[PDB]
C-alpha cells in the first residue's frame, strides 16, 4: 500500500 | 452487518497472526479497505496509508498491531487505546472519541467550513477515495469545476483568479492534523  | 478490521502496511508474517488471533477470538470479519463497517484499522509500520487515512476519517481506532499479541495472550479483545497510533497520526483520537460520542451516524465537520472543492481527475491519492476523504470529513466536492473555489491535484485547464488551486497533500495533512492547514503552503502549479 502506498504511502501518501 | 459484523464490524470489520482492515490491516495496513502489515508484513505477510503478521498477517498471518492477525488472522489466526481473529479466528481465535472472533468477533470481526478482515477486510481489504476501510469501509463503512470498519472499526478497527490495524498497522504493521505507522505509514500514512489510504487505509489509514479512511481509518481516521471514520472515526476507527487505528492501532498498533501489538494490540493483536496482547489480545491473543489475555484470551480476549482488550483496551485499544494504550495501542492507538496517536504519536504518528494526532487526529485518529480525536476523530474516534468524536465517532464514539456521536448519537446519530458520525460524520467529521473538519472540512464544513470550506468552499465546495472540485478534485482533479488526475489526482495522486486517486480520485474517488480521494472524494470520499473530503465527504467523510464534511467538505463538498463538486463533480464540475465551475462551481469549486477549490481545485485539488493536477490541473492544466484555465485557471481563474477566484479559485485556489492546491495540491492532494492539504487535504492529508488537514486530516491527519485534524485541522485545515494552510492553504498557501500547498500551491499546485
Not at chain 2, 71 to 99: N, Q, V
Not at chain 2, 115 to 126: D, E, K, R, T
Request: glycine share 6%; aromatic share 8%; hydrophobic share 40%.
Amino acid at each position: 500500500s502506498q504511502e501518501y | 452487518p459484523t464490524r470489520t478490521l482492515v490491516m495496513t502496511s502489515m508484513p505477510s508474517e503478521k498477517q498471518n497472526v492477525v488472522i489466526q488471533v481473529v479466528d481465535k477470538l472472533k468477533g470481526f470479519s478482515i477486510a481489504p479497505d476501510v469501509c463503512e463497517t470498519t472499526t478497527h484499522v490495524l498497522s504493521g509500520k505507522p505509514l500514512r496509508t489510504l487505509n489509514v487515512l479512511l481509518g481516521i476519517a471514520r472515526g476507527c481506532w487505528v492501532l498498533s498491531y501489538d494490540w493483536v499479541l496482547w489480545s491473543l495472550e489475555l484470551g480476549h479483545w482488550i483496551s485499544e487505546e494504550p495501542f492507538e497510533l496517536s504519536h504518528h497520526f494526532p487526529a485518529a483520537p480525536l476523530c474516534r472519541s468524536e465517532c464514539h460520542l456521536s448519537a446519530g451516524p458520525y460524520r467529521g465537520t473538519l472540512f464544513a467550513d470550506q468552499p465546495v472543492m472540485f478534485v482533479s481527475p488526475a489526482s495522486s491519492p486517486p480520485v474517488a477515495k480521494l472524494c470520499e476523504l473530503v465527504h467523510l470529513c464534511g467538505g463538498r466536492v463538486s463533480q464540475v469545476p465551475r462551481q469549486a473555489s477549490i481545485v485539488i491535484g493536477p490541473y492544466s485547464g484555465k485557471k481563474k483568479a477566484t479559485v485556489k488551486y492546491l495540491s492532494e497533500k492539504w487535504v492529508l495533512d488537514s486530516i491527519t492534523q485534524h485541522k485545515v492547514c494552510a492553504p498557501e503552503n500547498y500551491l499546485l502549479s
